[PDB]
C-alpha cells in the first residue's frame, strides 16, 4: 500500500461552487466557460509504481495526465492552455501547480470523509468541486 491509495478509483462530480469565477480569473472565454461549467466529469485516478495517472472524462473534453511526484511536465489543459505542471503530496493533499504566461494556478485534491474535494485557486478566487465514488 502506498502514497495515494485513498485517491485511487473512479469518482463522479456531485457539486461545484464558483467555477465560472475561477475560469474567468484564469482567462477562459465565454463559450468555453459555459460548456465546461455544464460538464459533470468523471475523474479516474490510478497508480502504477511511481507513476500516477489522472483522467477526466466528460461531454466537454476527455483529458489524461501521467506524472511522477515532484517532476515537472508539460500539460495542455482542457481550455487549451499550454502549462508547466508540478504535482506533489503535502501532508496527504495532492498539490498541482500550473505555470503559464507568468501566471499560476493551484489545484488541491484531498480526501474528506467519503468525498474527494478539489479546490482550484487563481489569485484571490477559489472554486470548490466535490466528487463521490462512482
- Residue 36 binding ligand Q6I, by CB under 6 A: yes
Strand, coil or helix: what is 33? helix
* CB 84 to ligand Q6I: min, Å: 15
- Nearest distance in Å: CB 118, ligand Q6I: 5
Q: Does 52 bind ligand Q6I (CB under 6 A)?
A: no
Q: State yes or no: residue 44 binds ligand Q6I (CB under 6 A).
A: no
The stretches of the chain forming alpha helices (DSSP H) are: 19-26, 30-38
The residues that bridge with 108 in the sheet, in sequence order, are 95, 119
Phi and psi for 60 in degrees, rounded to 5?
A: -75, -55
Give the whole-angstrom CA distance, residue 67 versus residue 21. 28
Binding site for ligand Q6I (CB under 6 A): 23, 26, 28, 36, 39, 41, 56, 58, 60-61, 63, 77-79, 107, 118, 120
Amino acid at each position: 500500500s502506498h502514497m495515494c491509495d485513498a485517491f485511487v478509483g473512479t469518482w463522479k462530480l456531485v457539486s461545484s461552487e464558483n467555477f465560472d469565477d475561477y475560469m474567468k480569473e484564469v482567462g477562459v472565454g465565454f463559450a468555453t466557460r459555459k460548456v465546461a461549467g455544464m460538464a459533470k466529469p468523471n475523474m479516474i485516478i490510478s497508480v502504477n509504481g511511481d507513476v500516477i495517472t489522472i483522467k477526466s472524462e466528460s461531454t466537454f473534453k476527455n483529458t489524461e495526465i501521467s506524472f511522477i511526484l515532484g517532476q515537472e511536465f508539460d500539460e495542455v489543459t482542457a481550455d487549451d492552455r499550454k502549462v508547466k505542471s508540478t504535482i506533489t503530496l503535502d501532508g496527504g493533499v495532492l498539490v498541482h501547480v500550473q505555470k503559464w504566461d507568468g501566471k499560476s494556478t493551484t489545484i488541491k485534491r484531498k480526501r474528506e470523509d467519503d468525498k474527494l474535494v478539489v479546490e482550484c485557486v487563481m489569485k484571490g478566487v477559489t472554486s470548490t468541486r466535490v466528487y463521490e465514488r462512482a
